[PDB]
Amino acid sequence: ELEELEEFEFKHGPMSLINDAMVTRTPVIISLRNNHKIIARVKAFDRHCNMVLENVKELWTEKKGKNVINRERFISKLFLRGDSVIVVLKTP
Amino acid sequence: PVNPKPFLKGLVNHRVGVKLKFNSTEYRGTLVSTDNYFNLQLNEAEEFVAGVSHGTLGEIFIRCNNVLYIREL
Amino acid sequence: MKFTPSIVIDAPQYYVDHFNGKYNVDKCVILRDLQLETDSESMPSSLKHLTKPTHILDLTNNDLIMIPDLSRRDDIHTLLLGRNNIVEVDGRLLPMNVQNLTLSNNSIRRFEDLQRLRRAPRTLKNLTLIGNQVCHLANYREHVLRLVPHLETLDFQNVTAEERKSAMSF
Amino acid sequence: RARDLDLNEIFTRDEQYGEYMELEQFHSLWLNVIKRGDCSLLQFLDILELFLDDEKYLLTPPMDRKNDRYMAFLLKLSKYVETFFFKSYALLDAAAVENLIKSDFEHSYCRGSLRSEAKGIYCPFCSRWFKTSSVFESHLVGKIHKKNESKRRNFVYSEYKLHRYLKYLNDEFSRTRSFVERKLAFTANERMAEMDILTQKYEAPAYDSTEKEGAEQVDMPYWLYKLHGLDREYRCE
Amino acid sequence: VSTPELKKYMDKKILLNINGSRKVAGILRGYDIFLNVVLDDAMEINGEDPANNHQLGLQTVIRGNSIISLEALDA
Amino acid sequence: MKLVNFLKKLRNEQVTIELKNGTTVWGTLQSVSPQMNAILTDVKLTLPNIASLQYINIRGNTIRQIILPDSL
Amino acid sequence: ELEPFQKNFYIESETVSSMSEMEVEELRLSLDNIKIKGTGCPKPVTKWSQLGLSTDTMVLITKLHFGSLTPIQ
Amino acid sequence: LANLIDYKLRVLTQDGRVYIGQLMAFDKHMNLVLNECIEERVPKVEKRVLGLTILRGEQILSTVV
Amino acid sequence: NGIPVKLLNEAQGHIVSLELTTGATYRGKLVESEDSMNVQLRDVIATEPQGAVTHMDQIFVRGSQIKFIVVPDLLKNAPLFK
Amino acid sequence: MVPPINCIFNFLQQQTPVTIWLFEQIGIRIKGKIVGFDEFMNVVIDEAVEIPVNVEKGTPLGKILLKGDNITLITSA
Amino acid sequence: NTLYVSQLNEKINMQRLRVNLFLLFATFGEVLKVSMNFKKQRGQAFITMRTIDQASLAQISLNGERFFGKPLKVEFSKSETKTL
Amino acid sequence: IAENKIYKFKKVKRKRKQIILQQHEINIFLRDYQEKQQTFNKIN
RNA sequence: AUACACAUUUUUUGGCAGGACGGGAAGAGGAGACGUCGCGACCCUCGCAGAGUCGUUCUUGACUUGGUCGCUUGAUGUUUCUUCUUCCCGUUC
């Protein structure tokens, strides 16, 4: 019974965003604590918000001796810790 | 006793805003749901950084740990 | 006979007393990174298999003629060269941070042969030449001080500004 | 003579001593040089294929060939492919190959080696065509072409090398692309066991204690025996 | 959950140093398993020099997770 | 379920771990603990100039993310 | 109360999934006139590598089966 | 980690300080006891001989042989 | 319990040095050590990261706040070699 | 000489205005009445105000659920 | 295996004294002792040696050797070292 | 090529790692050879 | 031969922000606290033992509890304020 209630609470709770993400294979963007952002598709998740992410594009912001420039790179198979997550946004 | 959990349950389905500990980000949106560990789900979210609108994010998840406080708007 | 990697792999390897680390060199003979003692080392070579983890090198009681053929070893701080027959020193030694050199009981004859020790930048703090013929030659101490002022303690005696100044006067 | 010779210090595990070439890293770097994530490992390889053609990498470039990030990437990649090439074929005279390519570069490539019946003659350095060979020649002395050939020389040459070396390695390129698709279509357990295999191949003795030396070739009564009484073995004392 | 053996410190004046380089002084009232503390006659020592009697008798509570260390003024 | 088990499957895999401190790690996973403490061999490590290390063990909570091969 | 299990292990390769329906009809006609009945039939493959088998298996098969995939395969 | 026992090990702390010492024992929290442990900061410069130390697993970043 | 916790309980009654997350150093005789690393200390000489040094009679610091301790070498003999 | 939870309970009953010191933040502190709390020390605080110290100004926030982790020091004013 | 030395310039710091002693006595064999236990200097250093012949050879060869200004006096230790 | 033979005898097939190894060994051998050939040209 | 390791002390976080190079010296227009470990010594001090005692047996179990002055230009972090030229010795092209 306990397992059931846990999965259900997960389903109708805030986690529903990441659950929806995996089932729809939709892209989501993740604001992290490193001040880097990860837009990707959710392959797997965890109660800690540990995740396996595919088609990762991380965007970030760097300062140089002139105007601030945004920098970005593609990481196809990315596994991510759960405490780095500030926010997970789901959008069209 | 009126506990934070019932106050928050009553706050569900209402326009809220949440100030994180960083204060670098506030989020104003409808409060869809909150779990027992107090992670936050908002919809139609709007981001206010330094008190100014950064943009409209939409359906958003907030890690419990980052939450400083939540207020109703 | 020769210092070769097969020997590099399996000597009594351990940590100095001083907790200085190392990994020693003895398949049948001469050693490195610890106790390079008593196996008739003619010429140093094949230090590369030492692959850097060594603070100290106890070369004593071998038949070493000169000190060249040192690969770049950042970690080596102490060389215990005693009881060999070192006639000369290479010059491009420059293993950065070689703090201590023990030349005791060797066969370095001339002051000029000591010149290459000046190359040791500011790390060669401790140098002991006692037991060499060069020690007997006149103004040996002062010439070592004027040549390599980096030395803080010579022959287990400490430099001192007095004989620094005398070394300047001559 | 070569007792301290070790291949693992020359080949990575993903290269399998020349079987494959590891391009994932370049997908990271190369893919990032695009400032997005729309690019998959396979789409990246699809991009590389351009360099098998003699004209595609020149007239259908992934990015603008005057882009910085792009030219830098291309440099790194080119270098990799070349070192891999000579690494996987020690026995061939490296200097010979190098000089061959260099002479092909000078005598043909930079001499209007790319010709179109419609647009005329293309120039790697200025990325422009030319009506006839005449205007093409009198353009190779102009201040423009001098500038470009004087600034983008190393890049052009590196691009070219990437081209010809990738051509010489077509079989390895294909072999790897195949590998990619396979691993990709694996499950968890499958991918794991495969990785195990690559690993074992990597950390295994080049000669096993169990190899061959000098093994050269040239050029009814079933129920009846039970009935008989053999259900219980009898004995005469 | 273990309880801190703070009984020896009870009803003693103590100087608590707290995260953010904060420092308060007050008599140890109560505590819990959590190391959360009740302090009576609490006085905040600001970084400048003055001190403010925040809780003369009204008493304050300090979260144990924020308590860096605690010095006994008395013996 | 538990992703840490998914990491337990990852022995003998070559990976690049970014860490919360910003450090980059590159090496073959020998094992990962359930704490997500990762023990690796043949590691080149870049602190925010690469130091080459035979074996490296990392405390799991420090790990920012681990980048796996795309072949996986 | 039966134990659930996985039966679909097939990942259609990109090159195959790019094929149009007319392409697929044509491929079947060319493969000794393959005729299918039933709903939802996946497209035929033409190469052992479009099936996502480990390298071991690949080596083994080839070895096991020599030449092109048969129409039935 | 049990294999690493008794070895001389280099731990990197949370604050960037580098500690080096023999690994005598561990625990669940990864609290380590290090015999004859010394501290190095910048790379030798600023080396101190601490002796026998416990380190807390919350502070530890990584260890190397 | 942790084996290092067991050692630290053996360290009671000896003189130990403590460095906290702030960086201040407290040297003195350890009265008491809980399982949570909360330690009661006597006659402490404290050296701040600025270099300033103070003396205090009784000090008790939370476990979580401690970076590390140094304990006397007497204990190194046993029984943790096993 | 009373446990802190009972201290907070008397804040609850008395309905006194309460000043919370947050974690690692000297610049701002929060203030308002405690209408309720839970075991995690998360507090519903009414007529709450943000008080930047850096004369003091503040922002009226109305009802607030403040997470207990920020809590450094709960007081009365 | 252990030799007791005395009559040494105590003005030298402990760690430099130990490093120079290990240096000097390494010529006869491996010195096992890492550090002076006695922590009083004044010459009273003990040097522990893995083999006994290196202890005897050091004793005979380095009697009255000038070490940091003073001729060292060397004898065999009264008791066996704890590490032996 | 296929039968892995040079004249009459078909030799056992070797694994890739060994083939490559021996190829690099032969590489250094050919290096030595080229060196000796050089010095010899300079002496004769 | 027979479950668990995201809600205060640890791991699911309060974190984020010829040319160049070095060294050493001289000449012209880096220094002051506050600590912590070193080169020498006119000094102190003067010796074999983690230390000190006992029960039982040929080796163990219990019980108690460098310091000072210079540097005659030693090494090192907090923390405030405001380079040129010449000669010598090393690396690189």
Q: Is the Cα dihedral C40, C41, C46, C52 positive or negative?
A: positive
Do residues C103 and C135 touch, judged by C-beta distance below 8 A? Answer: no
B71, J44: Cβ pair inside 8 Å?
A: no
Partner D contacted by F72 (CB < 8 A): yes
Task: Write phi, then psi, for B15 (nearest 5 degrees).
Answer: -75, 125
Number of helices (H), then strands (E), in chain F = 1, 5
Scanning every residue of chain H, which has its alpha carbon at the shortest distance from the alpha carbon of C77? H44
Separation of alpha carbons E75 and C16, rounded Å: 48
Partner D contacted by L44 (CB < 8 A): no
L9, D18: Cβ pair inside 8 Å?
A: no
State both tokens at J44: 């519903």
> If you write DSSP's letter for every residue of B25-43 in order, what string do you get?
-EEEEEEEEE-TT--EEEE
The whole-angstrom distance between residue L33's C-alpha and the CA centroid of its chain comes to 11
Question: Which domain CATH number covers K47?
Answer: 3.30.70.330
Cβ neighbours for J2, distance < 8 A, ≥ 6 positions apart: E29, E30, E38, E59
Q: Which residues of G touch D182 (CB under 8 A)?
A: 49, 52-55, 58
Separation of alpha carbons K70 and H31, rounded Å: 48
| Residue at token pair 């890739």 | L16
To the nearest 10 degrees (0 to 180), the angle between helices C161-169 and C140-147 is: 90
DSSP conformation class of C117: G
Across the interface, of J36, J61, J69, the residue whose CB is closest to B71 is J61
Query: In angstroms, how far is the first alpha carbon of chain J from the final one?
Result: 20
Q: For an interface test with I, which of H12, H19, H54, H61 has the most I Cβ atoms less than 10 Å from its Cβ? A: H54
The total of other beta-carbon atoms located within 10 Å of residue K7's CB is 14
State both tokens at F61: 């909570």
* Residue range of the domain that includes B25: 1-72
Interface present between E and B (3 or more CB pairs within 8 Å): no
Q: Which residues of H touch F55 (CB under 8 A)?
A: 64-65
Question: Which domain CATH number covers I29?
Answer: 2.30.30.100
Closest CA relative to residue G51, chosen from C11, J47, D181, I51: D181
DSSP conformation class of E60: E
Question: Which domain CATH number covers F66?
Answer: 2.30.30.100
Separation of alpha carbons I60 and E35, rounded Å: 12
Q: Which amino acid is at G2?
A: L
Query: In angstroms, how far is the first alpha carbon of chain E from the final one?
Result: 29
Q: Which residues of E touch J68 (CB under 8 A)?
A: 63
A89, B58: Cβ pair inside 8 Å?
A: yes
B69, J66: Cβ pair inside 8 Å?
A: yes
Do residues F27 and F44 touch, judged by C-beta distance below 8 A? Answer: yes
Do residues C3 and C44 touch, judged by C-beta distance below 8 A? Answer: yes
Q: Which residues of F touch H4 (CB under 8 A)?
A: 57
The total of other beta-carbon atoms located within 10 Å of residue D37's CB is 25
Largest CA distance in chain J: 35
Q: Which amino acid is at G51?
A: L
To the nearest 10 degrees (0 to 180), the angle between helices D41-49 and D24-32 is: 90
Q: For an interface test with D, which of G15, G55, G57, G62 has the most D Cβ atoms less than 10 Å from its Cβ? A: G55
The CA-based dihedral angle spanning residues D183, D184, D187, D189, taken in that order and rounded to the nearest 10 degrees: 30
Interface present between I and H (3 or more CB pairs within 8 Å): yes
State both tokens at G30: 């060319």
Scanning every residue of chain B, which has its alpha carbon at the shortest distance from the alpha carbon of J71? B68
| Residue at token pair 């038949």 | C63
Question: Which domain CATH number covers H13?
Answer: 2.30.30.100
Partner B contacted by A46 (CB < 8 A): no
Separation of alpha carbons G57 and D194, rounded Å: 10
The CA-based dihedral angle spanning residues G23, G27, G30, G33, taken in that order and rounded to the nearest 10 degrees: -110
Q: Is the Cα dihedral D189, D190, D191, D197 positive or negative?
A: positive
A15, B57: Cβ pair inside 8 Å?
A: no
State both tokens at D198: 């690559």
DSSP-assigned beta bridge partners for residue D115: D121
Q: For an interface test with H, which of F57, F63, F64 has the most H Cβ atoms less than 10 Å from its Cβ? A: F57
Separation of alpha carbons I27 and I24, rounded Å: 10
Task: Write phi, then psi, for D97 (nearest 5 degrees).
Answer: -60, -50
The CA-based dihedral angle spanning residues G33, G37, G43, G45, taken in that order and rounded to the nearest 10 degrees: -50
Residue nearest to nucleotide M43 (CA to C1'): K11
Across the interface, of H30, H64, H65, the residue whose CB is closest to F59 is H30
State both tokens at G25: 């009809």
Task: Write phi, then psi, for B32 (nearest 5 degrees).
Answer: -80, -50
Side-by-side strand order, sheet with K73-76: K45-48, K2-6, K73-76
Number of H/I CB contacts below 8 angstroms equals 54
Across the interface, of F22, F64, F70, the residue whose CB is closest to A77 is F70
Closest CA relative to residue D11, chosen from D88, D93, D89, D91: D88
What is the set of domains in chain E, with CATH numbers?
Answer: 1-75 (2.30.30.100)
Closest CA relative to residue C51, chosen from F54, I25, G8: F54
> If you write DSSP's letter for every residue of I12-49 in order, what string do you get?
TTSEEEEEETT--EEEEEEEEE-TT--EEEEEEEEE-T
| Residue at token pair 């990441």 | A18
Separation of alpha carbons D75 and C74, rounded Å: 33
Q: Is D96 exposed, middle or buried (0-12, 13-18, 19+ CB in 10 A)?
A: exposed
Separation of alpha carbons K5 and D142, rounded Å: 87
Region of E35 on the Ramachandran plot (φ > 0 left; ψ -120 to 50 alpha; else beta): left
Instruction: Give chain F's contact residues with H (Cβ, < 8 Å).
Output: 19, 21, 35, 37, 39, 53-59, 62
State both tokens at D235: 């004995």
> If you write DSSP's letter for every residue of D166-227 in order, what string do you get?
HHHTHHHHHHHHHHHHHHHT--HHHHHHHHHHHHHHHTS-SS-TT--SS--B----HHHHII
Radius of gyration (C-alpha) of chain I in whole angstroms: 13
Give percent helix, percent strand, percent coil of chain G, each to the nearest 5.
40, 0, 60
Separation of alpha carbons C48 and C4, rounded Å: 10
DSSP-assigned beta bridge partners for residue C102: C80, C128
Closest CA relative to residue E13, chosen from E30, E31, E25: E25
* Residue range of the domain that includes K25: 1-84
**Nearest nucleotide to K44 by CA–C1' distance?**
M47
Task: Write phi, then psi, for D223 (nearest 5 degrees).
Answer: -65, -15
Query: String of b and e for D60-77 (b: at least 16 CB within 10 Å)?
Result: ebbeebeeeebbebbbeb
**What distances in angstroms separate CA A41 from CA A29, B60, C18, F36, one per listed residue?**
9, 15, 56, 23
- 3-class secondary structure for J10-22? HHHHHCCEEEEEC
Do residues C52 and C73 touch, judged by C-beta distance below 8 A? Answer: yes
Separation of alpha carbons K36 and K46, rounded Å: 7
What is the set of domains in chain J, with CATH numbers?
Answer: 1-76 (2.30.30.100)
Task: Write phi, then psi, for D73 (nearest 5 degrees).
Answer: -50, -60
DSSP-assigned beta bridge partners for residue G16: none
Q: Which residues is chain J interrupted after (C–N above 2.5 Å)? A: 54
Q: Which nucleotides of M are covered by protein (CB under 7 A)?
A: 5-17, 23, 34-41, 43-51, 66-67, 72-73, 75-79, 90-91
The CA-based dihedral angle spanning residues H17, H18, H24, H28, taken in that order and rounded to the nearest 10 degrees: 50
Please state whether the peptide bond connecting residue I79 to the residue before it is cis, i.e. omega within 30 degrees of 0.
yes
Across the interface, of B39, B40, B57, the residue whose CB is closest to A89 is B57
Query: String of b and e for B45-72 (b: at least 16 CB within 10 Å)?
Result: bbbeeeeeeeeebebbbbbebbbbbbbb
Give the DSSP H or E segment for F41. strand F38-46
Instruction: Give chain E's contact residues with J (Cβ, < 8 Å).
Output: 10-11, 18-20, 22, 24, 28-32, 34, 36-38, 42, 54-55, 58-63, 65-66
- Return the ∠ at Cα L27 (arms to L23 and L31), rounded to 5°: 170
Characterize the bridge pairing of strands C66-67 and C88-89: parallel
* Residue range of the domain that includes H53: 1-65
> If you write DSSP's letter for every residue of K6-66 in order, what string do you get?
E---TTS-HHHHHHHHHHHHTTTS-B---S-SS---TT-EEEEBSSHHHHHHHHHHTTT-E
> If you write DSSP's letter for every residue of chain A in order, what string do you get?
-HHHHHHHHHHHSTTHHHHHHHHHT-EEEEEETTS-EEEEEEEE--TT--EEEEEEEEEEEE--SSS-EEEEEEEEEEEE-SSSEEEEEE--
DSSP conformation class of D230: I
Across the interface, of I2, I71, I81, the residue whose CB is closest to H31 is I2
- Return the ∠ at Cα F70 (arms to F26 and F30), rounded to 5°: 40
**Residue C161: how many CA atoms within 13 Å on its side-chain side?**
0
Structural domains of chain B, count = 1
**What distances in angstroms separate CA D84 from CA C3, D50, D89, one per listed residue?**
35, 19, 9
Task: State how far residue D184 is from chain F, nearest Cα, in angstroms.
Answer: 6
Interface present between L and H (3 or more CB pairs within 8 Å): no
To the nearest 10 degrees (0 to 180), the angle between helices D188-202 and D170-184 is: 140
